[PDB]
Design a protein around this nucleic acid. Structure first.
Lengths: 100, 132, 378, 63
RNA sequence: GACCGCAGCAGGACUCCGGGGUCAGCAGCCUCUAGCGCGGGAGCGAACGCGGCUCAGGGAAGUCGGCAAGCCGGCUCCGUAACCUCGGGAAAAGGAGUGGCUCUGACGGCCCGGGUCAGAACUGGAACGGACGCGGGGAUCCCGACUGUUUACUAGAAAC
RNA sequence: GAGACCACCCGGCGCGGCGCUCCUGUACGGCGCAGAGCCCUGCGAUCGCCUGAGGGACGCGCCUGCAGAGCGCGG
């Protein structure tokens, strides 16, 4: 089950100090995946970390698209969030790739 | 003359306003405003059409200076709201020396003069070239 | 010693205690004088502030510099989804003071009104007026109860519910208000008038007329814990002062040994029930009419909706009342409008030359989407 | 309604919107917005700002 | 980074070697090498503080006092007053220019080097020391000629 | 819409799209006999067109996508 969702990180740091933007952004990615995944464990590929910090700790990209897979077993289902680089974030919305 | 609708007062006391008349004064220092009751700590304030007690600056002709003179502010840099909703402001703050009776001390009022100043004081209205 | 220079107190002690309003919405409290000789009229109506606008007006105020002259004023649109009566409450005048003498509820109470009864409708058991519906339905019980009101009641009130589905907000649960019935020749006529309005819609047009002045009641905009300088209006002290200049310096003398309630102290500013008064009703109309707010000079259909929608409010699909100036409260807040208790005698007559439907979101120059489309054309 | 245009922008000021400046040449300069006014007070040329009808005229996009 | 101050004490400790760019610079501002992430973290984004910005119109009317802040400033080129122990005053005051591109002259050695100084065009919302660095100025009066020195830790002075 | 914490007010929320409106001021790139000139088809600060463009939005309208109302606790 591979969810495909975009997240606007500009909307995430709204209300928080610019110096801690990228750390706040990473937390938002964990929290906003948890809402989609419905499972608590979220592990983000190092690629997701590099993208959020591409333009520094104060000017995180305005939007990031993440492909998240829910692979897990023995009740510890976890979501593995990767970074999908998109030229256009225009007509982009949840695009789950099937189930199980 | 008549009743003046409140306009934002842009020139506090200590303001120096230009002279718009050929009286021979160039700069007028606002000592006070006529009809002002005060509140503790509040400097007197004045706007277009209000009589202000002024003193002529050192640049002025000797006869005019060293005495308090009454004048009416005719131009105000601060924007003000007329009842119709018009917000109007002027390039400079200027005044014309006029006795409380309403006799101008000057033959001509140079430059634009505000409508409010012109209605309240009749002699300013005839003399002013334009009432924008 | 003495203050030396005379200065007034800062703030109205009448408006103390300055606490967040515990009452949920602005309450009518006192209602207009009955008169005892007028067509029976309801005296109040709830509204949700929709927005503010500009209205060009022609002034007929004799003796004023504005006579025979145009003016532009702040208007405040109060969205008015039509209310529905759900009950009638009668009140005996007792020595202790007005005390209720029983209320007769509607045979059928609407879901919005029922939603008000519960904190969570989905998880509740919907057990409201369950045995009441059976006791009524036939309606013989309702008439018997209404008859008890006719003899034992002197002040009659109508309970009414707003429907928030036809309003852009997410309240979903209804707001209930006891609107007084005034002016009828006698109490028996008053309750008869009430039965006709029962379980049927009431519109602002019936309650208030253009040209009348109404008193607007609502909870004010909340600023949270504020400093004395913002909350009570005091001076920011000299900027050469240690420990801060945003504080009243001395809060009392040696004696009285206690801080007096007069002295300004820092607390909650905002969310206060306040009643404004004598705001003239410029225009009552429905947004369903395309030409509802059109005037002869514009020559455009001009509905009440600004281009891009009211800001922090939405569709205003139904009827609306426009008041002169401002009413207490932020946009999206319930505001009880009540007939004036003391109207201003020398108010001019309202004739609106132009209304502004230019977008309030940003600065608008086009009053219709078609008008903005025409300008940008290609 | 009665309408005026910006002396700089050349867009119809709607009634009740805008600021009017009386210049020392006795010329009223009506300004639609604060931006209309600020460009004039920096004497920045009207014909080098594209949104202005003056530049629309120069491009010949709107004349 | 271990010394000395009761501490893993924004305290105090003497040397030696000292890259690049912008620059008059060993200045400020970013960087290569090399070091490295410091008595802890999360939230919320009240009052009030503490540092930092901006503010219409007026402008010291505020105050014991313009305290604090603001102005000014780099370079080139004009233009510089009273006064003077003739050295100074003086950067007096008071102005004008300054960017990018495209060129054109100057200046050596014997076709080979320097990159500074002039002079143009042309271009840009009416902009250029575009960060940074970096006097506000004048008129007087009293003391002490001056550079110096001074009560470690409330007087830096007209005192020595 | 309310707030230090609480409380208050409202609730199958929200996320991220799409229109509308608005902010700024005409996006990258491609094109030109633009361009002061210089020099070989090279160079060039810039300028005009595609473009009141593009980029952005915390206001509105909608779902077109994912979702969203605890047999959690207490009575």
């Amino acid at each position: 089950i591979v969810y495909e969702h975009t997240i606007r990180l500009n909307k995430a740091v709204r209300g928080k100090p610019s110096k801690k933007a990228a750390p706040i952004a990473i937390r938002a990615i964990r929290a906003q995946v948890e809402k989609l995944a419905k499972v608590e464990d979220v592990r983000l590929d190092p690629s997701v970390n590099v993208f959020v910090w591409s333009r520094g700790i104060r000017h995180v990209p305005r939007r990031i698209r993440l492909e998240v897979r829910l692979e897990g077993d023995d009740e510890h289902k976890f979501a593995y969030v990767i970074n999908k680089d998109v030229e256009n974030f225009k007509h982009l919305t949840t695009e789950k790739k099937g189930s199980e | 003359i008549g009743n003046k609708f409140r306009i934002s007062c842009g020139l506090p006391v200590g303001a120096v306003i230009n002279c718009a008349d050929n009286s021979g004064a160039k700069s007028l220092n606002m000592i006070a405003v006529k009809n002002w009751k005060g509140h503790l700590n509040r400097f007197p304030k004045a706007s277009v059409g209000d009589m202000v007690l002024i003193t002529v600056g050192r640049d002025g002709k000797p006869e005019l200076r060293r005495k308090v003179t009454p004048a009416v502010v005719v131009r105000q840099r601060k924007v003000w709201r007329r009842k119709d909703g018009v917000w109007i402001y002027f390039q400079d703050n200027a005044g014309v020396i006029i006795n409380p009776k309403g006799e101008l001390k000057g033959s001509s009022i140079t430059g634009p003069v505000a409508k409010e100043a012109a209605d309240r004081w009749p002699k300013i209205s005839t003399t002013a070239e334009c009432v924008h | 010693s003495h203050r030396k220079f005379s200065c007034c107190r800062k703030g109205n002690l009448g408006y103390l205690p300055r606490k967040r309003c515990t009452r949920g919405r602005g309450r009518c409290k006192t209602f207009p004088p009955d008169v005892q000789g007028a067509p029976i009229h309801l005296t109040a109506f709830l509204g949700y502030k929709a927005g503010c606008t500009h209205v060009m007006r022609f002034i007929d105020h004799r003796g004023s510099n504005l006579h025979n002259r145009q003016a532009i004023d702040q208007a405040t649109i109060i969205d008015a989804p039509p209310m529905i009566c759900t009950a009638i409450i009668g009140y005996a005048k007792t020595p202790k003071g007005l005390r209720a003498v029983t209320t007769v509820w509607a045979a059928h109470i609407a879901e919005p009104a029922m939603r008000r009864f519960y904190r969570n409708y989905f998880h509740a058991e919907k057990t409201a007026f369950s045995t009441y519906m059976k006791k009524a339905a036939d309606g013989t019980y309702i008439k018997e109860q209404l008859g008890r009101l006719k003899q034992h009641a002197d002040v009659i009130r109508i309970v009414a519910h707003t429907q928030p589905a036809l309003t852009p907000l997410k309240q979903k649960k209804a707001d209930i208000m006891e609107i007084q019935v005034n002016g009828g020749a006698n109490v028996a006529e008053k309750v008869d008038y009430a039965y006709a309005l029962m379980e049927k819609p009431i519109s602002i047009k019936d309650v208030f007329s253009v040209g009348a002045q109404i008193d607007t009641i609502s909870i004010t905009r909340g600023r949270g814990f504020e400093g004395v300088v913002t909350r009570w209006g005091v001076t920011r002290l000299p900027r050469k002062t240690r420990r801060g200049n945003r504080k009243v310096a001395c809060i009392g003398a040696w004696h009285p040994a206690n801080v007096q309630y007069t002295v300004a102290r820092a607390g909650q500013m905002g969310y206060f029930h306040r009643t404004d008064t004598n705001k003239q009703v410029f225009m009552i109309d429905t947004a369903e009419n395309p030409r509802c707010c059109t005037t002869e000079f514009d020559l455009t259909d001009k509905s009440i909706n600004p281009v891009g929608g009211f800001v922090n409010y939405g569709r205003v699909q139904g009827d609306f009342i426009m008041i002169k100036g401002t009413c207490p409260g932020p946009k999206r807040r319930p505001v009880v409008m009540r007939n004036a208790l003391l109207p201003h005698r020398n108010c001019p007559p309202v004739q609106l030359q132009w209304i502004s439907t230019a977008s309030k979101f940003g600065h608008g120059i086009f009053e219709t989407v078609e008008e903005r489309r025409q300008f940008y054309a290609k | 309604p009665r309408i005026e245009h910006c002396s700089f922008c050349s867009k119809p000021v709607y009634p009740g919107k805008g600021i009017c400046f009386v210049r020392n040449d006795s010329r009223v300069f009506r300004f639609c917005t604060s931006k209309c006014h600020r460009n004039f007070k920096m004497k920045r040329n009207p014909r080098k700002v594209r949104w202005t009808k003056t530049y629309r005229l120069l491009h010949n996009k709107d004349m």
